[PDB]
Amino acid sequence: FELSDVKSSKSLAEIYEDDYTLSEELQKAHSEISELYANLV
Amino acid sequence: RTRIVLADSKIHILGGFTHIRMARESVVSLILGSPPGKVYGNLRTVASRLKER
Amino acid sequence: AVGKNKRLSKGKKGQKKRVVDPFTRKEWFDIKAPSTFENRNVGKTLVNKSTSASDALKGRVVEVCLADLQGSEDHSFRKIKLRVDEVQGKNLLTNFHGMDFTTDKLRSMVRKWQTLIEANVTVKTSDDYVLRIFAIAFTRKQANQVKRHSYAQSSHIRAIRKVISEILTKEVQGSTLAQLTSKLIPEVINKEIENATKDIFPLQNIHVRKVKLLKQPKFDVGALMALHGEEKGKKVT
Amino acid sequence: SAEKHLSSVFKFNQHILKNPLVAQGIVDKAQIRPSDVVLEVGPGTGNLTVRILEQAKNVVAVEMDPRMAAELTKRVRGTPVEKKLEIMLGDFMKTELPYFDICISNTPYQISSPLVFKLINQPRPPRVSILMFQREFALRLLARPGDSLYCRLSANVQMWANVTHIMKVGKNNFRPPPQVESSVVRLEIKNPRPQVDYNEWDGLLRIVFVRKNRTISAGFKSTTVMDILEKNYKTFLAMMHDVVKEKIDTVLKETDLGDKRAGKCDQNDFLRLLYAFHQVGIHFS
Amino acid sequence: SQVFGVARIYASFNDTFVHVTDLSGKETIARVTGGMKVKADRDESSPYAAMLAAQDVAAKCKEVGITAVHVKIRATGGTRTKTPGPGGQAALRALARSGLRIGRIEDVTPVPSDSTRKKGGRRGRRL
Amino acid sequence: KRNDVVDTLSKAKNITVINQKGEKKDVSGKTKKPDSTNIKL
Amino acid sequence: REERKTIIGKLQDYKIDTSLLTSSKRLGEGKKYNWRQRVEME
Amino acid sequence: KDINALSVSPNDSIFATASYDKTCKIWNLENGELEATLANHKRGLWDVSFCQYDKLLATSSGDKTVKIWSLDTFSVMKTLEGHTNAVQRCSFINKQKQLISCGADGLIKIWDCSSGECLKTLDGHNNRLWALSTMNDGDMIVSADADGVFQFWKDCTEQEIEE
RNA sequence: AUUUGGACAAACUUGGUCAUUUAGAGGAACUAAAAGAAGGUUUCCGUAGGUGAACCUGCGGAAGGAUCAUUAAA
RNA sequence: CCCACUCGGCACCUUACGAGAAAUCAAAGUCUUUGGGUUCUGGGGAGUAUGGUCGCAAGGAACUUAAAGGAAUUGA
Ligand SMILES: [Mg+2]
Ligand SMILES: [Mg+2]
């Protein structure tokens, strides 16, 4: 794990709010990877 | 998962009861003389535990 | 920790049974303030009923904010201690016992870049009431001042302290406590200190921080009644 | 399915030696007679035990870590010396140890001082013992009267035994390197044991070594020391604060030790002080 | 028609005391602590224990006749920390929720003009 | 790997364990322990 | 040594137990027995 | 320290006192002379109970253990462990065979004196048990909670085996 | 108080005799046995100590040790 | 209190047409190599061995089969 050393953009309410509501970004890369592979193929 | 205001020699910590105690320990270690790098490592350890629970 | 896992203690062996509710035997009593204050009603207190009740009442001290007694928020930061001296038909006649400020107000005035001047005097009233007064003052910067700070030389501090002690000593000696308390409420003492010490050095937040009552003479019920401004019984049949 | 019991005693949660020369030396200086049963503390993997097992009638290896115990077992199973090794597991301060003639120990430094006195008080104690301590603790055992490190440990251990330095072991020889330097020593418990009560000797030494470089008289000026010695005297009479004060003064003056410092006193000086107090009826413990 | 008490809250590091008494302070009306309301030592200072203690006191006060209270919160003070901890803050919130009218809130922590040495030693404490 | 350690200890016979009380008990958990009359008769 | 031997020898004359003596460590602190078995049997 | 319990032997020849100073002393009843001192527990003794048939003594401590003493040797025969909290009462049932104990954990444990194993655990209380009385060699057992709840236990081994 | 004699008689020691459990070592039977990662630690100076010392501790001192936010007022 | 000036002080910021390899220095500068007066001083971290010096204690009885002479809920 990596720990952020910069000021968090999310206010303390937001972090609690977000956790109230494996990774979307990771799946975002997966879709792009498939698109890049398909175009290259 | 807290917020800290360092007003001169006066420290205020905002957060949940368990969270502010965790922040207080790290701050106190720094006051007692622990170098920041060593405190940063322990923060990573507790930060990992916080996610699994 | 009332859990079962908590280790047993020796003291748990024999415990008195709770068989009497204490408030069954308590009796309520009403506290009244001197005539120097606008609001006489300052609440009520309770004591075990006489088997006497008066003995526990006498010497009891209650501290209350001046804002309640004067009905104005301007005294929110000042507290007055009143001591029970006489009891008459559940009415507790109280007398002035001391004065003090709230801690939050004291911390507010103390600030950096200025000098703190505090003076104290032990002095007695004309009623032979020995009391100790504490005064506090702070330097201030003039209207056109450009320096960040407004420190005063120790010569100015010693000069100001001497003036303050003279004023505190003068007023207390030439006044009764009932008169002295009458002076505290409008804060005329502070304004007098301002004008006298002003030519020495400009000042701000001049206040009488605290008042203590070191000694008391022989209690006088006649004087106490006059300060508060007898009654036949009813035939029981 | 022994996990039920072994887990009830251990949780299954060290600096290992890496110089063969010291290990061979410790065995060599032991001079194990063939008819000697040896007690081996901190057997570790078994590097030192196997050398001892070759020369000894029987070897009792005392261990605290269950994991290392298996390592010792696997190294000795199906060998001529398997029948002469008794591996014991667990904390060994509390138990009554068997009889042993020689003790070779790579002791955990935490249990150094309990171990040194367990061997001393062991009924029929061993004749020679090669123990591995840290430099500071070892030097205090080896400290002589008048030295900077002379202390209660030096005086107590030197009357029940004789401690002599063997070797210094550096922090490089151990991995991971410890922050303190090591050394080997030999302890020779005296036989017959000196016929002085252990409590009486330690009782006197504790009072006078509160401030070792301070005069002996000042040690007896303490009110608590005055109080306890008074109660001890009352117990002696049963089988007076001013009286005990005078009694202490006469003993210190006559023995000519009241102006001396415990850091510069020998066994004789303490013995003379102990005797004079007994004549006057003050029994320390 | 409004009888006033004094709610004295002592918020220590290891416990919280909620103590309601008359205006004089000589007569105790109800004293409840976090330890009485929790099963483990570690949780005595917790805000959860403080709220249960405050609610229990408020129920007792209404029975006796007290309908309003003046809050006088304090910390350990002396040579130790001077600000009431989260335990004291939780008790204050619980009293407000209980329905008792809060008259005046003041911090009366014992603050020394000058103090004796602290327990830590030269190198500090509170690891 | 701890279970492998435990089985090795139980496999061996020259091993004794100390409980917190200091008692001498074998791996299985039972207290580990000649008379002229018994051997002759 | 001979001085040591004499002193220890004389200590033998003045020797006692230490169970009751306060340790110096405190300085820092400052019918038949089974008649019941008969009645039930009968 | 404070004396917690007193027990009298079957023949009234000796009686034992349990104190919170971690010791039990056995006194000769006729003269009051100290027959022996039993000092093995680590916390103060809450109760001491003579065995009513042979020369045994059970002492209950705050160290969560109960120990059976042989009077003839005045030594600890068996030590019983398993209570989560201090053991407040201990009495013999079924003559020499078994021992029943109560603790602050609210659990009543029936032990086997010979083997020192917990045969049964009766859990009908939610608080510490100060009082425990037995009748007819433990055929009837009554335990009182600190809350004020009585549990009148009746032996039913003979009944269960018949079923 | 104390003495003689006559019965009742607790308790003690002793060899036997019946009943009850009960400890090791043997011998010889019967029954049962459906599982399958990493993870505590500032560097020293002077002085004083150390018996659960892989190092600890008391007093005074040093940086040769990583400064974010708010902040003139109105 | 404000402004301007002037002595002495704790300090600070920007720069050196100077110095230094550099960190940096109003001195650690005195226009290429050198003299205003005067006091003192000089010519790191790990190991190896010793024809050297000085020091440092106490005390008055082995033997088993080497070994299936075994393990085994797992075997023959
Ligand atoms: Mg803490
Ligand atoms: Mg040092």
**Inter-residue long-range contacts of H138-143, CB under 8 Å, 24+ positions, other chains counted:** H138/H91, H138/H92, H138/H93, H138/H94, H138/H98, H138/H100, H141/H93, H141/H100, H141/H108, H143/H102, H143/H108
Cβ neighbourhood burial of C14 (10 Å; 0-12, 13-18, 19+): exposed
> Contact, D274 vs D201, CB < 8 A?
yes
C-alpha dist (Å) from residue H55 to D149, F14, H11, H101: 57, 38, 11, 19
Contacts of D159 (CB under 8 A, 6+ apart): D194, D196, D201, D267
Pairing of strands H56-61, H45-50: antiparallel
Q: How far is G2 from chain D (nearest CA, A)?
A: 11
C112 touches chain E (CB under 8 A): no
Task: Name the DSSP class of C11.
Answer: G
Domains identified in chain E and CATH numbers: 1-127 (3.30.420.80)
**Bond prior to D125 in cis (omega within 30° of 0):** no
How crowded is residue G9: how many other Cβ atoms within 10 Å of its Cβ? 10
> Contact, E49 vs E37, CB < 8 A?
yes
* DSSP symbols for F1-41: -HHHHHHHHHH-SSEEEE-TT--EE-TTSSB----HHHHH-
* DSSP symbols for D180-235: S-EEEEEEEE-SSPPSS-HHHHHHHHHHHTTTTTSBHHHHTT-HHHHHHHHHHHHH
Q: How long is the CA F25 to C1' J75 vector, in angstroms? A: 29
Tokens for H41, please give them.
């527990």
Cβ neighbourhood burial of C130 (10 Å; 0-12, 13-18, 19+): middle
* DSSP symbols for chain H: --EEEEEE-TTSSEEEEEETTS-EEEEETTT--EEEEE---SS-EEEEEE-SSSSEEEEEETTSEEEEEETTTTEEEEEEE--SS-EEEEEEETTTTEEEEEETTS-EEEEETTTTEEEEEE---SS-EEEEEEETTTTEEEEEETTS-EEEEE--HHHHHH-
Q: Determine, for residues H85 and C4 on separate chains, whether the beta-carbon distance falls below 8 Å.
A: yes
Tokens for F12, please give them.
């061996």
**Chains near A, with 3+ CB pairs < 8 A?**
B
Which nucleotide is at minimal CA–C1' distance from E121?
A: I58
* DSSP symbols for C156-176: HHHHHHHHHHHHHHHHHHTS-
Q: How long is the CA D88 to C1' I21 vector, in angstroms? A: 37
Contacts of G1 (CB under 8 A, 6+ apart): none
Resolution (A): 3.0
How far apart, in whole angstroms, are the C-alpha atoms of residue F16 and residue F9?
A: 9
Q: How far is D238 from chain G (nearest CA, A)?
A: 11
Q: Determine, for residues C8 and H84 on separate chains, whether the beta-carbon distance falls below 8 Å.
A: no
Closest listed residue to residue C123, CA positions, set C177, C61, C186: C177
In degrees and rounded to multiples of 5, residue C69 shows phi and psi of: -75, -30
Residue type, C175: S
Q: At what angle do helices C177-184 and C154-173 cross, to 10 degrees?
A: 130
Beta-strand (E) ranges in chain C? 26-32, 41-48, 61-65, 78-88, 91-101, 116-124, 130-139, 203-215
Suggest the residue from A1, A11, A17 to mutate for an interface test with chain B (most B CBs closer than 10 A). Answer: A1
Chain I footprint positions (protein CB, under 7 Å): 10-12, 22, 24, 37-43, 48-55, 57-60, 63, 65-66, 68-70
Experimental method: cryo-EM
Order of strands, sheet of E101-107, starting from the edge strand that comes earlier in the sequence: E28-33, E16-21, E4-11, E68-74, E101-107
> Contact, C225 vs C145, CB < 8 A?
no
Cβ neighbourhood burial of F7 (10 Å; 0-12, 13-18, 19+): middle
| Cβ of B29 less than 7 A from strand I | yes
Contacts of E94 (CB under 8 A, 6+ apart): E50, E51, E54, E55, E58
Q: How long is the CA E18 to C1' I69 vector, in angstroms? A: 36
Task: Name the DSSP class of E25.
Answer: S
